[PDB]
Structure 1
C-alpha cells in the first residue's frame, strides 16, 4: 500500500536499473488491480447493504467476509512482489531494505 511505495523508495538505482524495474512492475500492477478491485467491490457491497438497512444481515455478514479475505490477499500479493524485488537487489543493499520492510510491518504499514 504505502508499504509498497516505501519499499520502492528504499531501492537505490541508476537511470538504467529504474527503467528496467518499471518494465518489470506490470506483472504486479495488474495482480494488484485485480485485488484492489474485489476489495473495493466488497466494500461497496457493504455500504449498499447498510444504506439499505443499517443493521447486521446475511448481506453484511457476507460482504465483511469478502472485505477481509481480499485485504489479506492484497497484503500477501504485496509481500510476494516485495521479496521478488529483494532478489533483484545487490547483496549490499539487502540489509537496509530488510530493515525498512521489517520496521514498516511492525508498526502496521501495508
Structure 2
C-alpha cells in the first residue's frame, strides 16, 4: 500500500540514477515528514474534539477537514515525486517502472 516504497523496492534505481535522484529523494523525504507531522497533529485534534464532546461539531468538522487536506497533500506529493523519479530514469527502465506503478495504483497504493 506504500506506493513509494513499493517502487524503490521492486524497481530500484541503478547506480547513476540513484546519484542523480539523490537530491530529489531527500527533498521528498523531508516534505513527506512535514505532511505526516501535520496529519498526526490533525488526528490529535480530532481525538481531542471527540474526547471533549463525542458528536459532530465545529471542532470535529475542522479537524476532519484538516485530516483530509493533509492526506490529500500526501497523496499528491507522493505521486508528483513518483513522476520525478520516472523522469530521472534511463528511458529503457521506464517500462518496468510503469508496470509496477500501474499495478500498484489499481490496488489503491498511495
**Shorter-chain TM-score category?**
0.7 to 0.9
CA distance in 2, matches of 1:16, 1:108: 30
After superposition, the C-alpha distances for 1:33-73 in whole angstroms (9 at most, x for unaligned) are 11111111111100111111111111001100111111111
CA distance in 1, matches of 2:77, 2:102: 17
| Alignment check: 8 A CA contact 2:11 2:96 kept | no
Are the structure 2 counterparts of residues 54 and 37 from structure 1 closer, same or farther at C-alpha, using a change threshold of 3 Å? same
Over the residues paired in the alignment, what is the CA RMSD in angstroms?
A: 1.8
CA distance in 1, matches of 2:107, 2:64: 24
After superposition, the C-alpha distances for 1:77-107 in whole angstroms (9 at most, x for unaligned) are 0011111110111111111111111111111
- The TM-score, its normalising length taken from structure 1, stands at 0.87
After superposition, the C-alpha distances for 1:4-33 in whole angstroms (9 at most, x for unaligned) are 101112334455654554454211111111
| Alignment check: 8 A CA contact 1:35 1:74 kept | yes
What is the aligned residue count?
110
Are the structure 2 counterparts of residues 76 and 13 from structure 1 closer, same or farther at C-alpha, using a change threshold of 3 Å? closer
| Alignment check: 8 A CA contact 1:46 1:60 kept | yes
- The TM-score, its normalising length taken from structure 2, stands at 0.87
